[PDB]
Design a protein around this ligand. Structure first.
Ligand SMILES: Nc1nc2c(ncn2[C@@H]2O[C@H](COP(=O)(O)OP(=O)(O)NP(=O)(O)O)[C@@H](O)[C@H]2O)c(=O)[nH]1
Ligand SMILES: [Mg+2]
Lengths: 994, 15, 123, 205
């Protein structure tokens, strides 16, 4: 019954509109939902704008007059030029006359800010269409109207604020480069008169609401105005002195001064420097007297959230970091500026103590800027010794566990602070370690944080000073473990003792006995049931293996064998209580050491001794599960097989090409097992349906295949002898994985088969011509059919499919030349099918294949296949690219769409296509492709964008084609075309911008 | 360090 | 929290599911500590599961002895049983539930403490 | 004591799925674009009583834009969301913020980077800095793994109530209560439940 206002054949019920609106805003439930589908339908009515002058004049609901302006905004934006010239001045006068009426009624000017701000913006949308060519008196009349009322002058500051935003801050995406440059020029020519009004209102007072609205417009001007309006007047004196005392203006003034710290400044003029130092001096002075002193606990102020404190401190952090990162050199030479420089940094020290992660990351980026400057620039580091002294404690007490990026930044700052003063950093770290021992600052969180800071500064002190330091820490950390009582409290300390020693490999590589002791104790912790200690031992083990692996392969003095052999002899007893994932990490760590042995047959001997257990378990299951293959339904047998394989993947990951003999030891039975596991996966689906693919029995079976392929992918990606890969590995692999994939149901096809074929082609593709040709025969058509129905089903197969087609196009492109002509068409359909994906992991890959496919056709020269390609698929690739470029649903890939289209256009204006693109009858003979292209495109754009005049399509195509060599301009021409197709009446002269 | 190696070798978190 | 007058018999981390037969689709309901709570005054054992962080209840029902723990076709770490009176979101609605655990051990152990508590509710 | 929360951001970022996770606890795998707005009441239990959110879940698809900035009227808090796997979503954050603060001049706003559960992260943490100048609170969030999924509502509740020491507390648990005319029907729903596999069997839970 509320759907009556949708009938435009009658008149509009204003009072019913106010009911429908309030039912949507103040209402709830199903009546609110229905009220919305009406208000939306009312708004989307293409003739609804004709009723906006009733609502704005007669309605009493401010939310109705808002939606009226929303309909006007749409009309002014998209169809303003399709209007008869009469309406354009009725709307302009109605909006101007309305805004004037609201500044007179202080009840409206005060209690209806939303409707006024919306009105001012709708006024700006008109200025974007009519000003100044059809409204030159706007700015002068705006200034005369500002002296006749406080409410008008204040609101005029709102119009200019929105105007400057729409012209300089948000015009790149929304208007053409011609229309954008037009309004930028128009505002610059009339800004001297605007600044006069602004500076007068700032100096003459007195209404705070008018002052703030004026300051808010100044913030927008500092984005683009010439520097003389800031430095050649007296306005910096007012921003830094007068407006920092009142909290109403303090927030915006600080944001303005934050911008002024980033203007265009000739750093040769000695007077602007005094201005840049003066406003910083005044600002820090008003903060010290009118807000809070430099010794105030800002961590506590922020934590109390009184009023606007958390934003002032936010903005004060931005101001100081912005200014000092660009102007602190002005303060470092003069001795009368030394205290101003230091007080400024002392405020930052206080802010750096605030518990606010995003605020901390801000100030940390400045500390990074400073300590890197004190590490390189001469004579500067002594100015900040007291600043750096406190900074060390600030960072040592907020060291995060190694966001992964916050730690690297904290370590980098902390490493710089150690180079500037080793003695001070030791005293801070040892005294904090002492305060952990007396129990004052003792906590799990606080001992870990201290342990991370100590571990982060390794390799910055001399090997002698570091030696003395690590021992002092190890001593105090052990004494802390005898102190505390309870496995929990002792495991916390004992774990930090291992993180520290894992961080000092330089220390470990000079002391074998201590290093040997640490590894053996790590082994003992691998039998420790306490949660987090086995993973602590396994992580620290491989962590130290990575940096000290030489000391495990060479024969250390006073030892009878290299320690790698001793780890192998007891590996079963060492890895007995660890989880299967922890065993794989242990085996991976050993592979890191075995790779150091460059004696070949000695490295092979270690590999066989390391792989001893998984090989004996391998030969056992190879025999007892080949006759009869019943065990593959037993879960325990499947789990052993997966762990045997995952152990091979672990070692192959760290040994790479040095893994080939162990891979050969199992290769022919592993592929046989890959077959036998495939037989039951298919036998189970034929017995239980497609639901079996979800059952753990098949999920475990499909795991064996997923890991078998992963072991082969790992070695080939890292192999050095590519010949053996081709003549030993590729042959049985394809005859084991391809037919199984092809003749399986789509729900039983492992997507890693495509990934494994991608790595095979990536390494040895250029050596396997018929291999790639055979890979396509088994995986192309059947996978394409799995994904050519929607952008959703089988997402993993979708990504690996286009990865594989991409590398085939890069490496063995001749494999597509040997495709049947009907199958090559599906190949083209698949590439364009990738353009339409919103999934960027497919969209970018498809755009790349098209770009490389075109180049692959250009290299063939003037041959029949290349000519038949342009005859068939050239204009398809052009139109498909234009579609995804203009449908506003693939905006993430605009750059590669522009690049691919530019390559297609350039191919014609350089005569790189031999045959004519057209049929012999449809155009006169002798017509160049350059002309038929500008006709095919003109016809195509007219049928897809009938609201464009024939003169827009001409000027666009003219500019676009003659710019196919300048990508930055070409891209800009597309952006102008995209803007013009959202509206009617676009200027065809806008394509002459370049 | 031979003495430090024994402080950590003996270290018991079960006490 | 209105849990003081109770005792903790079993505790396990789980992910709770409910069936939407109108769509033939499993829908998550909660992730957190699934607790068995025996009433000190009535000896009745209930299930009380709260979501992590928000601490909102996603399961509140009596471990009734007439409930049966069936397996899910694609899981060895899950149990599927039908509930007839759950008061997590208000009135005693009836649900077809599925509860999954981190490993198979916790699931088999869950069936143990679930059949023990099934007996205490018979007394 | 209810507060209006406008939820805005590019299409596909995770606005609707985020709200459903707080309403039902489920994770919606399918993308169904919001048409205009979906209003939802959402209640949190804190140590300062319950707090209610009238969540105006808006539509980032421009073709389905609806009232556009009309939904922001009288909003008392806001969440801008983007997708760390899609740089164009973080690129459009200045636009979404601009349209927001023109209507709601001075309200608490949270900026959220969703889908941090995905390896191929395209919007790296060091690149996210837009919130600094605009005084917005930022969180890395994920609706699939619930990483920080409570943080935006906990920060706003602290900002709307004025208590920095506000915390979510456990809702009190009442006692649960205790025919063959429906046993064959409840059994009929169980036979189908068992034969419908559980989603995400490779997960941790
Ligand atoms: N991997 C992942 N996917 C997510 C996550 N959050 C949402 N999604 C997915 O992203 C897609 C978008 O879903 P949706 O919640 O409707 O986003 P929206 O912002 O409401 N879209 P609209 O702007 O049209 O209203 C869904 O497929 C959803 O499963 C997430 O945290 N992780
Ligand atoms: Mg949505």
């Amino acid at each position: 019954s509320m759907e009556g206002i949708l009938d435009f054949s009658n008149d509009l019920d204003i009072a019913l509109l106010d009911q429908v609106v309030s039912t949507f805003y103040q209402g709830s439930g199903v009546q609110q939902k229905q009220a919305q589908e009406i208000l939306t339908k009312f708004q989307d009515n293409p003739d609804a704008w004709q009723k906006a002058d009733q609502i704005l004049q007669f309605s009493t609901n401010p939310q109705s007059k808002f939606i009226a302006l929303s309909i006007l905004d749409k009309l002014i934006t998209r169809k303003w030029k399709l209007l008869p010239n009469d309406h354009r001045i009725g709307i302009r006068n109605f909006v101007v006359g309305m805004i004037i009426s609201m500044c007179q009624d202080d009840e409206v000017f005060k209690t209806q800010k939303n409707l006024i701000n919306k009105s001012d913006l709708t006024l700006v949308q008109i200025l974007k269409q009519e000003w100044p060519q059809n409204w030159p008196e706007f700015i002068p009349e705006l200034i005369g109207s500002s002296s006749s009322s406080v409410n008008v002058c204040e609101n005029n500051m709102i119009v200019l604020k929105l105007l400057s935003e729409e012209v300089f801050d948000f015009s790149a995406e929304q208007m053409t480069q011609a229309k954008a440059l037009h309004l930028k020029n128009s505002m610059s020519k009339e800004f001297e008169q605007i600044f006069k009004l602004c500076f007068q209102v700032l100096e003459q007072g007195s209404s705070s609401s008018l002052i703030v609205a004026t300051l808010e417009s100044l913030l927008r001007y500092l984005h683009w105005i010439p520097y003389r309006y800031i430095y050649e007047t007296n306005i910096l004196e007012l921003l830094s002195t007068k407006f920092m005392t009142s909290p109403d203006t303090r927030a915006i003034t600080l944001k303005c001064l934050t911008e002024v710290s980033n203007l265009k400044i000739p750093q040769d003029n000695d007077l602007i420097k005094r201005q840049t130092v003066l406003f910083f001096q005044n600002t820090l002075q008003q903060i010290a007297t009118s807000v809070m002193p430099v010794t105030a606990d800002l961590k506590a102020t922020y934590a109390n959230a009184n009023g606007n404190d958390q934003s002032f401190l936010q903005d004060l952090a931005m101001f100081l970091t912005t200014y000092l990162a660009r102007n602190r050199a002005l303060l470092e030479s003069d001795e009368s500026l030394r205290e101003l420089l230091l007080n400024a940094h002392q405020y930052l020290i206080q802010l750096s103590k605030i518990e606010e992660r995003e605020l901390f990351k801000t100030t940390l980026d400045y500390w990074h800027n400073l300590v890197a400057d004190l590490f390189y620039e001469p004579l500067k580091k002594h100015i900040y010794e007291e600043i750096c002294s406190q900074l060390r404690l600030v960072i040592i007490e907020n060291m995060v566990r190694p966001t992964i990026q916050l730690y690297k930044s904290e370590r980098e700052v902390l490493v710089y602070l150690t180079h500037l003063n080793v003695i001070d950093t030791e005293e801070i770290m040892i005294s904090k370690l002492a305060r952990q021992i007396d129990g004052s600052e003792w906590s799990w969180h606080n001992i870990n944080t201290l342990s991370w800071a100590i571990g982060s500064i390794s390799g910055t002190m001399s090997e002698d000073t570091e030696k003395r330091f690590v021992v002092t820490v190890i001593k105090d950390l052990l004494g802390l473990c005898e102190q505390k009582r309870g496995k929990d409290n002792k495991a916390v300390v004992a774990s930090d003792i291992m993180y520290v020693v894992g961080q000092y490999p330089r220390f470990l590589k000079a002391h074998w006995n201590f290093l040997r002791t640490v590894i053996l104790k790590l082994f003992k912790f691998m039998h420790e049931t306490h949660e987090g200690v086995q993973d602590m031992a396994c992580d620290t083990f491989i962590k130290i293996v990575q940096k000290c692996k030489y000391h495990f392969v060479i024969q250390q003095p006073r030892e009878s064998e290299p320690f790698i052999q001793t780890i192998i002899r007891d590996i079963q007893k060492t890895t007995a209580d660890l989880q299967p994932q922890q065993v794989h990490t242990f085996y991976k760590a050993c592979g890191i050491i075995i790779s150091e042995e460059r004696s070949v047959a000695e490295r092979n001997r270690l590999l066989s001794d390391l792989m001893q257990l998984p090989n004996m378990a391998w030969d056992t299951i190879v025999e007892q599960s080949t006759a009869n293959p019943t065990l593959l339904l037993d879960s325990e047998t499947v789990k052993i097989i997966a762990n045997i394989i995952k152990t091979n993947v672990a070692v192959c990951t760290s040994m790479g090409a040095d893994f080939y003999p162990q891979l050969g030891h199992i290769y022919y039975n592993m592929l046989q097992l890959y077959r036998a596991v495939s037989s039951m996966i298919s036998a189970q689906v034929a017995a239980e349906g497609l639901i079996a693919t979800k059952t753990p029995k098949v999920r475990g079976l499909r795991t064996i295949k997923k890991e078998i392929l992963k072991l082969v992918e790992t070695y080939i990606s890292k192999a050095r002898n590519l010949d053996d890969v081709v003549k030993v590995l590729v042959e049985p692999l394809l005859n084991a994985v391809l037919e199984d994939y092809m003749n399986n149901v789509p729900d039983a096809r492992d997507a890693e088969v495509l990934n494994c074929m991608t790595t095979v082609v990536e390494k040895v593709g250029h050596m396997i011509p018929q291999g790639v040709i055979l890979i396509l025969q088994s995986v192309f058509e059947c996978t394409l059919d799995m994904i050519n129905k929607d952008f959703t089903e089988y997402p993993e197969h979708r990504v690996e499919f286009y990865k594989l087609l991409k590398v085939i196009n890069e490496k063995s492109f001749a494999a597509f030349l040997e495709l049947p002509p009907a199958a090559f068409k599906l190949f083209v359909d698949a590439i364009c099918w990738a353009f339409k994906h919103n999934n960027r992991d497919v969209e970018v890959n498809g755009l790349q294949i098209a770009l490389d496919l075109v180049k692959n056709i250009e290299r063939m020269g003037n041959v029949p296949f290349a000519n038949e390609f342009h005859k068939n698929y050239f204009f398809i690739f052009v139109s498909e690219t234009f579609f995804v470029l203009t449908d506003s649903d693939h905006k993430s890939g605009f750059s590669k769409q522009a690049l691919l289209l530019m390559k297609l256009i350039s191919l014609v204006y350089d005569n790189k296509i031999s045959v004519p693109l057209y049929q012999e009858a449809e155009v006169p003979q002798g017509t160049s492709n350059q002309v038929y292209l500008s006709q095919y495109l003109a016809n195509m754009l007219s049928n897809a964008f009938p609201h464009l005049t024939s003169e827009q399509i001409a000027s666009f195509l003219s500019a676009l084609t003659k710019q196919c060599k300048d990508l930055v301009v070409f891209k800009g021409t597309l952006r102008d075309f995209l803007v013009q197709i959202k509206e009617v009446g676009g200027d065809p002269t806008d394509y002459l911008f370049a | 360090l031979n003495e430090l190696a024994l402080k950590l070798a003996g270290l018991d978190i079960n006490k | 929290t209105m849990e003081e007058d109770e005792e903790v018999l079993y505790k396990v981390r789980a992910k709770l599911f409910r069936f939407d037969a109108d769509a033939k689709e499993w829908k998550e309901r909660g992730t957190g500590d699934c607790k068995f709570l025996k009433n000190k005054k009535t000896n009745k054992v209930r299930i009380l599961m709260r979501r992590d962080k928000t601490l909102k209840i996603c399961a509140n029902h009596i471990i009734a002895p007439e409930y049966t723990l069936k397996p899910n076709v694609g899981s060895d770490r899950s149990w599927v049983y039908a509930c007839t009176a759950d008061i997590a979101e208000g009135e005693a609605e009836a649900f077809t539930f599925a509860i999954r655990f981190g490993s198979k051990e916790n699931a088999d152990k869950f069936k143990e403490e679930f059949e023990k508590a099934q007996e205490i509710n018979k007394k | 004591v209810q507060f209006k929360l406008v939820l805005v951001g590019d299409g596909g970022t995770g606005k609707t799925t985020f709200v459903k996770r707080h309403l039902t606890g489920e994770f919606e795998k399918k993308y169904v674009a919001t048409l205009g707005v979906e209003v939802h009441p959402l209640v949190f239990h804190t140590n300062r009583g319950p707090i209610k959110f009238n969540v105006w879940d808006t539509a980032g698809q421009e073709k389905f834009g609806g009232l556009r900035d009309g939904y922001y009227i009288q909003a008392q808090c806001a969440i801008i969301m983007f997708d760390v796997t899609s740089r164009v979503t973080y690129k459009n954050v200045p636009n979404w913020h601009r349209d927001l603060v023109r209507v709601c001049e001075n309200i608490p706003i949270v900026l959220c980077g969703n889908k941090v559960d995905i390896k191929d992260r395209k919007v790296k943490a060091k690149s996210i800095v837009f919130h600094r100048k605009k005084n917005l609170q930022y969180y890395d969030i994920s609706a699939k793994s619930n990483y920080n999924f409570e943080k935006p509502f906990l920060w706003l509740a602290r900002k709307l109530i004025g208590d920095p020491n506000l915390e979510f507390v456990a809702m009190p648990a009442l006692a649960p209560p205790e025919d063959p005319a429906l046993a064959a029907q409840y059994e009929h729903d169980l036979e189908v439940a068992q034969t419908t596999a559980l989603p995400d069997e490779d997960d941790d839970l």
